[PDB]
Amino acid sequence: DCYTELEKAVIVLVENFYKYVSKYSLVKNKISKSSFREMLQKELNHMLSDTGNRKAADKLIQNLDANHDGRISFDEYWTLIGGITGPIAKLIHEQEQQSS
Template structure:
């Protein structure tokens, strides 16, 4: 495990840490039951962390719909797997936008 993490590893770590930040207190490694992100926490996350990517992050109803669609086990809190699917659901559609931005940066360099 020597050397610095790659950009991809850094990105994965950032996603994990972001989950922990909004899921409340950190579960220990032996603890199977983590708190998950509440609806309130989820809205806060959308608004604070993804406000460039999501146009309607401050829209309470949109956030509620997103969490309702996402909360597979209907317990009102999103687990790490549900969170990961959310980010994937965001990343897929916006990947086109990201590519366009990337290309435009190349042209302006």
């Protein structure tokens, strides 16, 4: 009984990123491309059923900024979760209205 529901959800977003960093990674604030694709596939595969959906995801992965190291920071993973989740948000909230 303290934390708020939004605050619980930021926490899940934040625990969910760090679950994808491999144990004994010398970069332990960053996840790999292939570990990301693996999260999308496993953690979002309801929200990513459509095939327009699924596809527009991987271009964001593939469109990404080339870097010194090629891994994904937390700020980027957040920005990517948000390109997925943003064109659908109005549909996500519509669907919530449907039932309770």
